[PDB]
Amino acid sequence: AGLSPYADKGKCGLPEIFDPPEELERKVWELARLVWQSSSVVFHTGAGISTASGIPDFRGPHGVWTMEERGLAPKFDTTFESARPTQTHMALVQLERVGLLRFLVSQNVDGLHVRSGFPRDKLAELHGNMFVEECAKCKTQYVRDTVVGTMGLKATGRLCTVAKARGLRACRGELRDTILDWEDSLPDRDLALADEASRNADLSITLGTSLQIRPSGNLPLATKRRGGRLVIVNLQPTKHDRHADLRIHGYVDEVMTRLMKHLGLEIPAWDGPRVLERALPPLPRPPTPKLEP
Ligand SMILES: Nc1ncnc2c1ncn2[C@@H]1O[C@H](COP(=O)(O)OP(=O)(O)OC[C@H]2O[C@H](O)[C@H](O)[C@@H]2O)[C@@H](O)[C@H]1O
Ligand SMILES: [Zn+2]
């Protein structure tokens, strides 16, 4: 970690919980009905959906902050550039393709949602993206193929190339990274879209986040606030466990694989990094799912 020293990293290293198989099976069927029936589905993702790609989380038993409390560095089985989207990442791509996902709110800086092919206009990256730099003068973002090279909103060394003055010159503004440091204000645009999506959802589903950061972790509560349903999928306890209508303790890849199977949808294969700015028009709404035995 090349971001500021900071006391309050929240509750780290709590034990993991696994729902027994009968209960897990019933819960994922309930999740499948909810997703199928709801008019406006918002997913909230954190670091737990990228552990299967080899990227450690922050507050899990081997998390970056957990290990830091005992002086150790975390283990990175991949670099950000070489990380591959998980089944969860690709399941979200497909749910968006078939009109079963309205918006995706992510706290992850790992760049995997964009790189999986998920459309940027349905994505809020609340804490940054290691691959994205932004012009300090005109606010244009650049999605790079490789990590921009700084963190904590510093200058990257590159300048903005967007044409200005009838195309007689470039903006030349200073490009800076988008990775927030501790206590930085969230990106205005992304937060406002995320809060709007949550405020108008009838279903919010959280995946692999302990929900300990504010305001990011409080956004799913806005769904519950208007009488919509809240689902939390996580191995550890989360801050907002007491507000969930449905709580699922299991491997997020297991949950999402079973969910897609219940919806009658294939999880597509990833074929290398993409960047999709705007969502395509949806595929046909899938055949009506079969229900639980
Ligand atoms: N395969 C898995 N399946 C289900 N749950 C999992 C899995 N792997 C890990 N978990 C759970 O996944 C959860 C991940 O929780 P946290 O580690 O706090 O990550 P955040 O995304 O909420 O952290 C938010 C910000 O805080 C930081 O400062 C950064 O700025 C972050 O952006 C754990 O509770 C694990 O049990
Ligand atoms: Zn610019």
UniProtKB/Swiss-Prot annotation:
Outcome, altering residue 50 to Y: Abolished NAD-dependent protein deacetylase, defatty-acylase and mono-ADP-ribosyltransferase activities
Annotated consequence of substituting residue 39 to A: In AAA mutant; strongly decreased nucleosome-binding
Positions of the record's site feature: Formation of an covalent adduct with nitro-fatty acid activators: 12
Induction statement: Down-regulated in a number of cancers, such as pancreatic cancer or colon carcinomas. Post-transcriptionally regulated by miR-766. Expression is post-transcriptionally repressed by miR-122.
In-chain residues carrying the UniProt-annotated modification N6-acetyllysine: 27
Main location: nucleus
Active site feature: 127 (proton acceptor)
Residues in cross-link Glycyl lysine isopeptide (Lys-Gly) (interchain with G-Cter in ubiquitin): 164
Biased composition (Pro residues): 281-290
Post-translational modification Phosphothreonine, affected residues: 288
Keyword Glycosyltransferase: yes
Cofactor names: Zn(2+)
Outcome recorded upon mutating residue 40 to N: Does not affect histone deacetylase activity
Effect seen on changing residue 76 to A/E: Reduced MDL-800 and MDL-801 compounds-binding
EC number: 2.3.1.-, 2.3.1.286, 2.4.2.-
Stated consequence of mutating residue 268 to L: Found in melanoma; somatic mutation; reduced histone deacetylase activity; does not affect the protein-lysine demyristoylase activity
CC annotations in GO: chromatin; chromosome, subtelomeric region; endoplasmic reticulum; intracellular membrane-bounded organelle; nucleoplasm; nucleus; pericentric heterochromatin; site of DNA damage
An annotated GO BP: ketone biosynthetic process
Outcome of swapping residue 57 to H: Found in a family presenting with four cases of perinatal lethality caused by severe neurodevelopmental and cardiac anomalies; uncertain significance; abolished histone deacetylase activity; abolished protein demyristoylase activity; decreased ability to recognize and bind double-strand breaks (DSBs) sites; does not affect nuclear localization
UniProt GO MF annotations: chromatin binding; chromatin DNA binding; damaged DNA binding; DNA binding; DNA damage sensor activity; enzyme regulator activity; histone deacetylase activity, NAD-dependent; histone deacetylase regulator activity
Subcellular location field: Nucleus; Chromosome; Chromosome, Telomere; Endoplasmic reticulum
Binding site for Zn(2+): 135, 138, 160, 171
Complex and partners: Homodimer; binds to nucleosomes and DNA ends as a homodimer. Interacts with RELA; interferes with RELA binding to target DNA. Interacts with SMARCA5; promoting recruitment of SMARCA5/SNF2H to double-strand breaks (DSBs) sites. Interacts with the mTORC2 complex; preventing the ability of SIRT6 to deacetylate FOXO1. Interacts with the CLOCK-BMAL1 complex; recruited by the CLOCK-BMAL1 complex to regulate expression of clock-controlled genes. Interacts with CSNK2A2; preventing CSNK2A2 localization to the nucleus. (Microbial infection) Interacts with Kaposi's sarcoma-associated herpesvirus protein VIRF-1; this interaction prevents SIRT6 deubiquitination by USP10.
UniProt-recorded name of the protein: NAD-dependent protein deacylase sirtuin-6
Protein source organism: Homo sapiens (Human)
